[PDB]
Amino acid sequence: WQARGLGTARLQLVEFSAFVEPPDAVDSYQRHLFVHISQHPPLESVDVRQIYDKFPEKKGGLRELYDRGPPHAFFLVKFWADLNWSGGFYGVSSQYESLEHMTLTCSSKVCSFGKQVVEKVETERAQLEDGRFVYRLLRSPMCEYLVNFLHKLRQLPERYMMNSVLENFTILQVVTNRDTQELLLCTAYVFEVSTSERGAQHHIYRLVRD
Numbered sequence: 669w670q671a672r673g674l675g676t677a678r679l680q681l682v683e684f685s686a687f688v689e690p691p692d693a694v695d696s697y698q699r700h701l702f703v704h705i706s707q708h709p710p711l712e713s714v715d716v717r718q719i720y721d722k723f724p725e726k727k728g729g730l731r732e733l734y735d736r737g738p739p740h741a742f743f744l745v746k747f748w749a750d751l752n753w754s755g756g757f758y759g760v761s762s763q764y765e766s767l768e769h770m771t772l773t774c775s776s777k778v779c780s781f782g783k784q785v786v787e788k789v790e791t792e793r794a795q796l797e798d799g800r801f802v803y804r805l806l807r808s809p810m811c812e813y814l815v816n817f818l819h820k821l822r823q824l825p826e827r828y829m830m831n832s833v834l835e836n837f838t839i840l841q842v843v844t845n846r847d848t849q850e851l852l853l854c855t856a857y858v859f860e861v862s863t864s865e866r867g868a869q870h871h872i873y874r875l876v877r878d
């Protein structure tokens with residue numbers, strides 16, 4: 669009964685991307701993906717206690733949320749970001765899918781050294797498509813801390829210096845039913861840089877606890 673991708677039975681992540689389009693994409697289109705999960709054998713498990721220290725610890729960080737439950741909704745995603753590509757569009761697209769009509773509240777907490785730095789909260793409503801309800805947070809503008817972070821991260825004269833910086837940089841991402849405050853999906857993101865000739869890639873774990 670364990671999860672096999674990023675989703676419960678109540679809410680599945682269809683696709684998520686963070687991308688940049690260069691200014692000349694209006695002439696011939698071109699999209700560079702920093703990170704990408706597409707979802708059109710169990711997932712491995714990571715103890716949630718090992719990554720507690722990387723996330724905030726008062727209200728709406730990991731200890732309270734996991735003790736809130738439900739335990740099966742909690743995932744860790746490890747990203748190898750692609751960091752080779754000035755004034756283009758920096759974007760996040762998310763799609764979710766579900767069997768209910770809900771209203772989704774998506775929080776994205778960005779944490780540096782395990783304390784929250786910026787947070788964006790978005791509301792999306794179900795639109796019914798083909799017997800299933802679809803939630804489309806498409807082409808959301810990436811918030812300006814992270815765009816500035818990416819340019820300065822790219823500058824770094826070593827690739828292992830980027831991984832040192834990204835070690836203390838995490839994103840926590842909580843999706844709730846707006847009406848009823850049920851947690852549907854909590855995903856913790858930890859970050860490495862990819863090499864240039866490799867693309868972006870990801871590994872998805874379930875978060876489990878004793």
Ligand SMILES: *CCC(=O)N1C[C@@H]2CCC[C@@H](Nc3ccc(C(F)(F)F)cc3)[C@@H]2C1
Pocket residue numbers: 686702703747749750760776778786787788809810811812813814818839841859
């Ligand atoms: C304030 C930022 C914001 O609104 N969001 C939402 C989106 C949610 C989670 C993914 C994240 N996008 C990024 C992924 C990866 C990188 C990096 F630096 F390449 F590893 C940057 C942004 C944003 C945060």
